[PDB]
């Protein structure tokens, strides 16, 4: 048998036998994973390198997309292939309704979703006010470090290295150092409060509860660029991440991850450009508009249609 590693975002993997070599499909790979129907429903196989992540179709043959990654990169992006090695991942299905996710109780499905949500938080893809980031930090301390204890946790504990595993990298330098006391206090409170279940899946679910209300939760992210309407040129190039999820469309400044706009389905409309290299958003209810340039335009528009359509 040939085998392939299917990774998760924590860096773990499960090797799966390919019964039809490179003609094995995603559905067959999923069947060969260790998973009940219960755990499986929420997740599918994605192909991802450092700067390009794509959710596969169940009839796709993933080893062929790995094989063709260079053509795919050049069709969808301007990245240097030499810097992008793809792997296959088990990840949240981008079409998973938030209403369906909210009633999950399976502990394995909960930890897989938790790991993915943690990964996005630490990379900076979740925008939230400091109080919410502090609450998520305190939950990670309970999950990862167990019960609070003054001798260990009060002083010299929340240094750089440690803060790095609990706050977004975008807040580590500037903002994070000052949160240390409120994080600790909240952590203390989680431990000291016996009303709060300390079963692992319960705490992980609590972290997820606090992510579900973040507007980019569950987003597939794409890269693009907008041009400012201020002027000089006509005008300045702003690289952006475009987040698409079951809630709507979200633009992030590529460099700082700052949230530029968030638009809910029903409050905007889109049109694909003639060459498939851009799309336009019209925020009716605000009567503003903007154009994102990206070779992933077609993909972004088809996803907006699907996720708007299911809502």
């Amino acid at each position: 048998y040939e085998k392939v590693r299917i990774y998760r975002m924590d860096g773990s993997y499960r090797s799966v036998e390919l019964k039809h070599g490179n003609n094995t499909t995603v559905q067959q790979i999923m069947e060969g994973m260790r998973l009940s129907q219960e755990t499986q429903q929420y997740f599918t196989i994605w192909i991802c390198s450092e700067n390009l992540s794509l959710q596969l179709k169940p009839y796709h043959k993933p080893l062929q997309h790995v094989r063709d990654w260079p053509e795919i990169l050049a069709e969808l992006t301007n990245l240097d292939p030499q810097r992008e090695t793809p792997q296959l991942f088990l990840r949240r299905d981008v079409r998973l309704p938030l209403e369906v996710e909210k009633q999950i109780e399976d502990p394995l499905a909960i930890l897989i979703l938790f790991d993915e949500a943690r990964y996005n938080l630490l990379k900076g893809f979740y925008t939230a006010p400091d109080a919410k980031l502090i609450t998520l930090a305190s939950l990670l301390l309970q999950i990862v470090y167990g019960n609070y204890e003054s001798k260990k946790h009060k002083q010299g504990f929340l240094n750089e290295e440690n803060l790095k595993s609990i706050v977004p990298v975008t807040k580590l330098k500037s903002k994070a150092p000052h949160w240390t006391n409120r994080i600790l206090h909240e952590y203390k409170n989680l431990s000291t409060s016996e009303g709060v279940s300390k079963e692992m899946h319960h705490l992980q679910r609590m972290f997820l509860q606090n992510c579900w209300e973040i507007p980019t939760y569950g987003a597939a992210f794409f890269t693009g660029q907008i041009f400012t309407k201020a002027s000089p040129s006509n005008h300045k190039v702003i690289p952006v991440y475009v987040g698409v999820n079951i809630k709507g469309l979200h633009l992030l400044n590529m460099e700082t991850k700052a949230l530029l706009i968030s638009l809910k389905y029903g409050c905007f409309m889109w049109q694909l450009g003639d060459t498939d290299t851009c799309f336009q958003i019209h925020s009716m209810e605000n009567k503003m508009s903007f154009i994102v340039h990206t070779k992933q335009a077609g993909l972004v528009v088809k996803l907006l249609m699907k996720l708007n359509g299911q809502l």
Binding site: L54, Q55, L56, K57, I72, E75, V94, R95, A220, L299, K302, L303, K306
Partner: peptide
């Protein structure tokens, strides 16, 4: 071939 999501 090229239809994702």
């Amino acid at each position: 071939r090229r239809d994702y999501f």
